[PDB]
Subunit: 177 residues, 2 copies
């Protein structure tokens, strides 16, 4: 199976990144023999493209689970942000950008922008309902929140604990007011 | 001698912005610097000693560069917008790189880096508080929170800027840091 190659591949890029890992290593961790890679996939690069589309699609599914719900924009947003506390991928991919192909880098870039855009739509609905009581423009707040969390996550990784991200949830409560 | 030592560190430093630390061998490091191995080993006993000295030298120069930027006779606020504006001109890659490969970093190097970053947030903190004392920073948000917020948002903006390959996100962080100080 082809999903078992993708899945085994996904767990390796989580640990090792995309560039640094060769086509050899992906074959052993999945068990599957070496001739069989090119049955399922045209190349390392078409494989990468397919992981990321799958990562992106699965991400939009989690999002919909999380935000097609009976609660208020603010709660949806806090729900989502809380899930960061329990993407080290954006870091690894940002850490390797020079070596990413354009096609892959553009996928990720489009993904992130759809993400920020949807956070903003939810800030707007929020401000509309009256659950988010700040006046700052959605497209701006979305970005501040998102950038804050990527930075908190970088420092959590580095520090080997989550105090940055716990501060980031506290600070969000203040900004939504 | 001391200038040679510095050359080697500066060679190494460039290498590490491009390729990280754990990824590289001494060979690339020797090739980059132009120094024979026997020589390099007079200065540093191992790839690891050298990594520790590289980060220390980085932090040491960073704080000297902060001492300059911030001992003029301007506002706390303007001092802080200055620094940040410098962030935006093109450091943040080093934290992104090293965060990326944190699983393979020696504890020694991780501790040195961690403490550097903790000190920087605390200098920003000191400066936000000085600015609130004088009335140049009108926000009431406590300094220790605001310095984290600001520093976290800039790292995440630096990360997206690499992903997008232009600095739109860092430009917005700049414009946003002004709302937050008022």
């Amino acid at each position: 199976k082809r999903q078992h190659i993708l899945d085994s591949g996904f767990h390796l890029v989580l640990r090792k990144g995309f560039v640094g890992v060769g086509l050899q290593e992906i074959l052993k961790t999945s068990g599957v023999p070496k001739g069989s890679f090119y049955h399922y996939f045209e190349s390392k690069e078409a494989f990468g493209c397919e992981l990321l589309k799958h990562y992106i699609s699965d991400y939009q599914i989690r999002l919909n689970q999380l935000w097609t719900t009976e609660t208020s924009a603010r709660d949806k947003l806090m729900n989502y942000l809380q899930c960061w506390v329990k993407s080290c991928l954006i870091v690894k991919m940002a850490a390797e950008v020079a070596d990413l192909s354009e096609d892959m880098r553009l996928i990720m870039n489009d993904g992130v922008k759809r993400l920020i855009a949807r956070m903003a739509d939810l800030i707007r609905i929020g401000q509309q309902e009256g659950s988010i009581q700040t006046s700052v423009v959605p497209d701006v707040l979305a970005q501040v929140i998102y950038q804050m969390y990527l930075g908190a996550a970088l420092l959590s990784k580095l520090y080997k604990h989550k105090a940055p991200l716990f501060q980031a949830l506290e600070s969000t409560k203040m900004m939504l007011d």
